[model samples]
Target: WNRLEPALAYLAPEERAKVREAYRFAEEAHRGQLRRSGEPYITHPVAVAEILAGLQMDADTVAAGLLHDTLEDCGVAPEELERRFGPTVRRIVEGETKVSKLYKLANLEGAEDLRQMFIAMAEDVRIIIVKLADRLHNLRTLEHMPPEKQKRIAQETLEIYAPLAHRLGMGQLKWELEDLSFRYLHPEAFASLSARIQATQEARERLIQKAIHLLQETLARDELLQSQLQGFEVTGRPKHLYSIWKKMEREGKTLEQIYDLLAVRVILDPKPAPTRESQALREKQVCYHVLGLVHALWQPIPGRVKDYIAVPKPNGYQSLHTTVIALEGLPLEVQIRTREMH
Candidate 1:
């Protein structure tokens, strides 16, 4: 009741009309169906539509948001929808549909994986975004699922979507997806990592804040600097089960010894009005300036500096990562980069 109308408000007037039409069509198409959780079958697609709406997606994405499940769930067929809704919505809808009704591994590697790889190769970023939202909803409601089903979906999410998010440089969503997936994949490891991370939160944040403040102070002392940096927000995330367990198995580092588990990021402002060149000038200034401050204050670990900005990631991520020894010989990492690193 409370979900539909207000969510529709996020759409533009013309786009809103298209979404309304798609929603009605999807509702009728998914009728006579109920989820395993016993909710109205249409609720899941509507929720996905709302997510795209929140992202202010365009008309086709909004329409796809409403119709993403029709192919696999309703057996309506992609060709029929393509004929009716035009190729765009048809592709988007088909893009999110499962390969098989039961979705057994599509690749011999597993039938499910082969189909998933097809979607990823299609290279429609929006499709991945839609799938991530869909998995997020499922994982959110997994408490109502059987333990085995919960574990299965959680494993799929951790192995697939979370890494997909990282590939797209959505670090925030990537880690949260991993953390949620970890909760089901390995409950014991999840608990240990979460507890360890929580216990170290204050110390990590305090040192990071102190380092950031040092950068800001030095920037002010620079005669060339006028605008300030306040839009950035920083936080720490516990290493996920797979990452932690991988390091344990591969590198032989206990969770406690991975001192730079907390990777700090810097966000630079774009288009500061009065100082039209603010972003570019600040990039050069802060890139070196922050490095200087961090290195002088903490003894940087030998051979730990990485300058990805000069040589960006193939997928376009750029940042400077360096490890340093902080107070009491604790290892710390500081990542200096722009919002583009996101």
Candidate 2:
């Protein structure tokens, strides 16, 4: 409960109150139930709600997350949920329930079932988001499950949930789900990669720190650029284990040959403008300007610039991506985006 509080800080008082009420209601519904890990089942719902909160989901969606399992697990009636939480929360929870049933049947072998599952998820994107959070928490605590069950769940996550997260443009969630699934589905490969990454941790840290310092200094020293790029941040972007493995497989390259293992992100605050249209244009221009500054600081790799802002992904992801040779002559991929885009 305490851990979940701070994530709800963005909500209004009334909205927060509603989420709290939903928590209380769920706690009572799941009072004596226990998870496979021997923790009170309420902890799972709270954790799910926390994940939704982390995604900055609206109060209703978070509340639905808190109460998602009540209908199926606690035998709570739909009418009861509607009566207690109102229509939106009740509807979202209902959608989640429907999707969960479909998710169980979703597998690589069953293309039609997978299509049906996608349709169910498309009915309410919030439902899938909530389900993703729920599955993420489940995977986080999956150690207590039997080996066979763990493998099945992990495989399902890799085939279904992770791809859904990617399609939704939830990059962090997709990476985590993929990594966790990879860990369970192929323990040997996962362990080997983990060891390799751990071995390089110190060197990676030094390179990342040096790059950050260089970029920060360059941005600060430029008088005209400094004024326009207010509240800018330069930080190392983590490379996910599963992505690293996939890259090696796809490109037939050794771990040592992957240049983008070191990554940096430059996030800029959007300049205020008179209208939404002008504000968007200003944000795009600022992003491009920052990309130029980054290129000026480091020699960019030929044909490595990708302007996603001009043509966003189908899922609405926008960013300016460039690969450059930087500190110590290492290739570092730099991603530039506005705070809002992030």
Tens digits of per-residue lDDT for model 2 on 111-221?
Answer: 797687665465478888888999999999988988889899999999889988986778889999999998888989999988887777767989899999998888778
Angstrom error of the Cα, residue 130, model 2: value is 0.7
Steric clashes per prediction: 7, 0
Model 1 bad stretches (over 4 Å):
1-11, 54-56, 75-80, 96-123, 158-173, 202-231, 260-263, 272-306, 311-317, 321-332
Cα lDDT of all candidates, in order? 0.70, 0.85
Candidate 2 residue 28 C-alpha distance from true site, Å: 0.5
On TM-score, the candidate that comes out on top is 2
Instruction: Residues 63-109, candidate 1: write the lDDT tens digits.
Output: 88778888878877688777867787787777643332223444443
Number of the top-ranking candidate, with lDDT as the measure: 2
- Model 2 stretches astray by more than 4 angstroms: 96-123, 217-231, 260-262, 269-274, 295-318, 321-325, 329-332, 339-342
With a 3 Å backbone cut-off (N, CA, C), the pairs that clash in candidate 2 are none
- TM-score between candidate 1 and the true structure: 0.68
Taking all chains together, the TM-score of candidate 2 against the true structure is 0.82
